[PDB]
């Protein structure tokens, strides 16, 4: 599940690309969790996640980005 979520963030935005669709569920729960002290836990990667954040905002301003996982 974590891998799928990571793949989705890197090349697409949930609310960010165009808000997660109001569908299960699941996807929605993940969207809610999305912000965590540690997200790339059990998976292998992390800095890549920070890098992904960096790629966007980057037309997103630093603030929306911090607002997400931020840090």
């Amino acid at each position: 599940r974590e891998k799928e979520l990571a793949r989705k963030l890197e090349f697409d935005g949930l609310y960010i690309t165009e808000q997660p669709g109001d569908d299960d569920v699941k996807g929605q729960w993940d969207r809610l969790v999305l912000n965590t002290p540690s997200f790339p836990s059990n998976y292998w990667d992390k800095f890549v996640k920070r890098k992904v954040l960096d790629k966007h905002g980057d037309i997103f301003g630093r603030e929306r980005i911090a607002e997400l996982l931020g840090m």
Binding site: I59, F60, G61
Partner: protein, 146 residues
């Protein structure tokens, strides 16, 4: 000015009237295009700028950077937001600012800006894109065209 350009483009598209994947007429057209890189480049850049600017305007982050009681990005103000999205020619940026019409204090309605000239661009731009696409489809290589 825009209408005449569209007519010229139509005539050009019409001349090929199809052909071999590699064809003498095609080669000649490619050659003319190659001969003119700078003029063509300028036209393309202008179109992108018009579309790109519109897109930026449409964007929420852009709206957010320069909050105003009744519109405008202020001279500064619009410049900074554009800088923020970080995607433009600097000379191009200055040019965009110039294109925008100031109203007694760096105030721009803007939506008006997107609308004009977006409608005309949408009408012409399509013809140009179509011709370019057809040409690309017909003869690759030559790469220069690519």
């Amino acid at each position: 000015l825009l209408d005449l350009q569209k007519d010229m483009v139509v005539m050009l598209l019409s001349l090929l009237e199809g052909n071999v994947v590699n064809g003498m007429i095609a080669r000649q057209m490619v050659d003319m295009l190659v001969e003119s890189s700078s003029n063509v480049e300028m036209i393309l850049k202008f179109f992108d700028m018009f579309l790109k600017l519109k897109d930026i305007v449409g964007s929420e982050a852009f709206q957010d950077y320069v909050t105003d009681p009744r519109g405008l990005i202020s001279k500064k103000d619009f410049q900074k937001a554009m800088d923020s999205q970080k995607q433009f020619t600097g000379p191009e940026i200055q040019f965009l600012l110039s294109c925008s019409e100031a109203d007694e204090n760096e105030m721009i309605n803007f939506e008006e800006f997107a609308n004009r000239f977006q409608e005309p661009a949408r009408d012409i731009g399509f013809n140009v894109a179509v011709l370019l696409t057809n040409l690309s489809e017909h003869v690759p290589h030559d790469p220069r065209l690519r």
